[PDB]
């Protein structure tokens, strides 16, 4: 099963919420796309259980994008560069 | 013409390139074809070089059609086969879900116009015409934006 | 009574500018300039609430 | 797959474009149609292939007519008999 995963932010203040949370050996890629702020977790690796685990938390906040990450790759914007969520928690606090 | 995405264009403007740059003087298919492949990363582009056809395989051709070429490149406009290539592209966006249309939906448009400069290219350089619009369809649709739920 | 409490409605107004400044930001990285823009944008936001 | 294509072409001056190039291996005659000037090679001493090569050159400036070739041979009306594309260049163009 997947081991890295694509997950839609609502509104930016659903992130900074979200931003004062876990991160936990994620590095993690944050795209805007059509005003909502994707996040993709990119588990280096993680087994299944642990991954789906991990992704618990992040889904709080965060639905699981059904658009491939390919998608959001291309035609999104870059907000975050591969570690995210460690990062969007200075970019959105303090 | 009149919308298009960036990806869209910019393979039509390469094929204004490969108007001067291979002598056609206008601007057939092939070179549309060509700018697909040669955009590299862009959806269409991606698509030839998964089944093999890179920029070099393309150019090929290409080069075999008029092959560098009459460089003065008389009306160096587009030819009422690639403009009709365009407008396919548009209604293969249209198909795919895409307003102002990308690179893809051309490589699809091409498919589209199988007796065409492009598909002729890709019809000696093997590839079959629907294989290649396969693997652009399948790295297009299957979202939801603009929302994270209901 | 509630013709607009305290008229805190301005202060919804800066909060957007802000989402704005912040959000753009967010997207440039911009780190600390989204970072404190976040700030004054969430500062914003509990202070129309309470008004 | 046939040694021999029809193609068509909208104003004159589009055959005049084609016209500065390519006439080799075709010989071509050029039939008058509303408007339309259709073109015909017939690739001789070509295969396939090399039919499909030639024929794109073709069809970078025209289209690729859908008559029926006897319809195009009888009922169109010759602009140029012999090798076609060589003439049209002379005879527009210069």
Known sequence: ?94 | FGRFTERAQKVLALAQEEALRLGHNNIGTEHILLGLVREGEGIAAKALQALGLGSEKIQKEVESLIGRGQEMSQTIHYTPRAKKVIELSMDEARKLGHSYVGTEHILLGLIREGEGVAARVLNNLGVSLNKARQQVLQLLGSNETGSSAA | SFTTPPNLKELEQKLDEVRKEKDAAVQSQEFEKAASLRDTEQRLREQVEDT
């Open chain 1, 1 to 94: 099963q997947k081991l890295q995963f694509v997950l839609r932010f609502g509104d930016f203040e659903d992130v900074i919420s979200l931003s004062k949370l876990n991160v936990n050996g994620s590095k993690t890629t944050l795209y805007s796309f059509e005003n909502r702020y994707y996040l993709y977790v990119d588990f280096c690796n993680m087994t299944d259980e642990e991954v789906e685990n991990q992704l618990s938390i992040l889904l709080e906040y965060a639905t699981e994008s059904s658009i491939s990450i390919h998608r959001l790759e291309e035609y999104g914007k870059l907000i975050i560069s591969e570690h995210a969520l460690e990062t969007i928690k200075k970019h959105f606090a303090s």
